[PDB]
Amino acid sequence: HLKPFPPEFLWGAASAAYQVEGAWNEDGKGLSVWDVFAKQPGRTFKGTNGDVAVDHYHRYQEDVALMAEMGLKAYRFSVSWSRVFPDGNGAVNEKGLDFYDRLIEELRNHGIEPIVTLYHWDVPQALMDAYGAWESRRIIDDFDRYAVTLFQRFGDRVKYWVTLNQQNIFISFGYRLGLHPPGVKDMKRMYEANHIANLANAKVIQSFRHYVPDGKIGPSFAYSPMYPYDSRPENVLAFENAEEFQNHWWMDVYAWGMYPQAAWNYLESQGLEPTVAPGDWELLQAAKPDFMGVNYYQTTTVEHNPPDGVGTSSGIPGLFKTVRNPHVDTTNWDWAIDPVGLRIGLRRIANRYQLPILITENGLGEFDTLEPGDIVNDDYRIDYLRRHVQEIQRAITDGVDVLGYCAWSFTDLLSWLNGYQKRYGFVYVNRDDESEKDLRRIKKKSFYWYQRVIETNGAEL
Amino acid sequence: RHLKPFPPEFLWGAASAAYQVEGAWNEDGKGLSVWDVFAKQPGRTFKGTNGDVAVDHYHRYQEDVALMAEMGLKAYRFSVSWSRVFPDGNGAVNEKGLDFYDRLIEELRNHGIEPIVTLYHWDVPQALMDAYGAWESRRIIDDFDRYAVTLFQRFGDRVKYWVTLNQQNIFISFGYRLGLHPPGVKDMKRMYEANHIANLANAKVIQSFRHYVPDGKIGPSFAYSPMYPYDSRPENVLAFENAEEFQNHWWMDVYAWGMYPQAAWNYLESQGLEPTVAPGDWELLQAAKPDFMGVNYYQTTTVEHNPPDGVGTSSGIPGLFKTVRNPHVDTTNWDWAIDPVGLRIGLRRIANRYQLPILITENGLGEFDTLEPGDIVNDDYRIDYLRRHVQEIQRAITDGVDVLGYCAWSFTDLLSWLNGYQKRYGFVYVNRDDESEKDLRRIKKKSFYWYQRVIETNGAEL
């Protein structure tokens, strides 16, 4: 018999500041690296950018009212560092803090738990200009000063905090694939910036223990659990390599403060291991989180990759390469649909680290059709969410401590590079890639489905 | 890719177990072990074979050590028979029993061979079973500790490497779940209680070791079959998660971290099978970190989804996993997988999960060796098996696993627990069979000279 969801389960939904807020130059806000990057011609679909997005900065009262109508138990959002410190360091911007204060008060007045995410990829451009942002150890103290400011202003009202959201994405996309700022393709630089981000995460967790002694904090990891293609020993070995290189490389640092040794030795043999300073290991080991945040969309299957092989398939020669998994469904965008993979990832985190898990992001991006009468029938989104929630219930029954589930996303939002048409929200926003239209909010069918999930604490899916 | 060499102090070894080699079952004051009694029950063992004589290593140890020195062994791993040292398990120490192990250790040291002493290989004295049920009573924790401390005091000056419980998962599961080994019980609840007591005994002895052998290295040895999923079907990967945790982490997480894994614990709790925990248990288990994980390795196991009405050929646990033949590995003549890459995988998994050095305490090939005219045994099949495993160990070292040594199973042919003598494991053939001891003469197999050359070249010629 499946166990019920625990009574205080945080049924949530989530967003990110650049993707929803707009108001990119209002109330003293400084430029973020994304304000600049997205205005490079050709970088984003149809030149879409975060100047307005879905205008949540001005429409937050309506959006929170919709959350209360749904009965959301928690809303996870990120704070835009450039609103609080327009230059990254230096003078605090009270008008920027005041927006988040008003948002938090609106949530609390409706009984919704805020989950504050410190960082979703939008370091102030001034810090990139001054010292290269995440490539400089200077960012450790600047990020800590920013985080401490938020802990001081909001710790009395916010119990749950996420530090770096998807560090593995912003680091790898920014420094290895060149898809995100700063547009670099250099593995050596990637691992250096990654190490600095690890130190920044640990430093802010240490600060949190002083300023928010009753709070709960953790990083959030974009987790694609690895599978071996089959039981061929060389494919199982490729899986060992891939899970360690892609997943333990981050989560072991978060949980244990140590990089895994086989991956470290491989990077050292390539001259790619990060520079370690005295005190680094002590800091990383002394910053235990209360939970592991998990952003989940799909698993990855791997197979053996000879030393002259792949490096379609991607991988590392001599370690592993990816291969299409014939045993999982796909979305209309070729993302795998693997709800059991979420249960597997949750089981792996509990088994390896004994940590509670907050699922910070999971959802389905698809074209939605607006029908006359302001009707959006998104049964495909209900199907996807239902199947993932069902597997979470099985993970809970197995013994995993899952603190909550934040569906991605509450309203439709701006994609980093792909505009607006692949929508994720429970709430449709009437705008597209060419026009803001009237920006009106329209509840999708999935809104009412999730409302009923919450009312029954997951008993009716 | 440049392979790393075997480290300069790598323990090229071979191994045995006391009941399987010693004989002298009632000599020099030795008391009855549970195996002395069990193997004499009609029908328990093939052709009634038992350890009364075995290969008579108790009397022939000088000849056997001389062969080890001829081979150039760096280490010899053996077990101490508790019933020789404390015939009743507790009570009076038997000095003649200690004197045998003293003579053996001196013989090894005089030939430059490192002794690796194994405290327990399944032979608890029958008197402790009679009095209180042996591993089912917490009384065994202090009795085992007193025995271990006796050995630490007598031999700690000359023995650096110690193994505590050898293959706890086997003696506990075979003794209390499958009923194949003493005490012949089939009761999962009793199995998990005895297993918990064995965990506490292991931790207690490691704590004592820190007091008595401060420069030594100690660890348990686990019979490790690394699990594989059959394929990338999500339900088969989940079956693998269940199987690796339930079959492997259940033991190794206690050894390394002092904690049982939660999903397995909750499953047992739902069946009414979780062990009874006393105040102080977690503190003891957590405060007994080993210096290494010992690994007894023969093969991997591949698993697939098993519905709640499923298998309980294939074996498994309904709702968790079931085994399935792996189509991508060869098998021995007894349907055991031959999977040397699986040894590398298991070594990588232990380093990745626990960051522990590993002593491979047992690995070998059992086969029906033919004694040819001229006292020749051509066991190229054994050479091939060992060569491939040693090659994969070198790759694991190159990956970054700290492997302390490799003990081939076995040095001489020996008595199997239930299956007699015909399926042989030694580098040294022993002339006897299931019907009689013949003359017990020792005959070097071809593999003896192969391993001699491996050791001489520190693994460069395999």
Ligand SMILES: O=P(O)(O)OC[C@H]1O[C@@H](O[C@H]2[C@H](O)[C@@H](O)[C@H](O)O[C@@H]2CO)[C@H](O)[C@@H](O)[C@@H]1O
């Ligand atoms: O509109 P898109 O391109 O589908 O983006 C949706 C969300 O993507 C999340 O990150 C993804 C990323 O898109 C993938 O490229 C990467 O491989 O996986 C990560 C896993 O999260 C972002 O978290 C979110 O801000 C986007 O809305």
Ligand SMILES: O=P(O)(O)OC[C@H]1O[C@@H](O)[C@H](O)[C@@H](O)[C@@H]1O
């Ligand atoms: O002869 P069998 O049944 O294959 O057993 C071989 C070996 O099996 C191993 O599990 C034991 O550790 C050894 O003690 C034993 O010799």
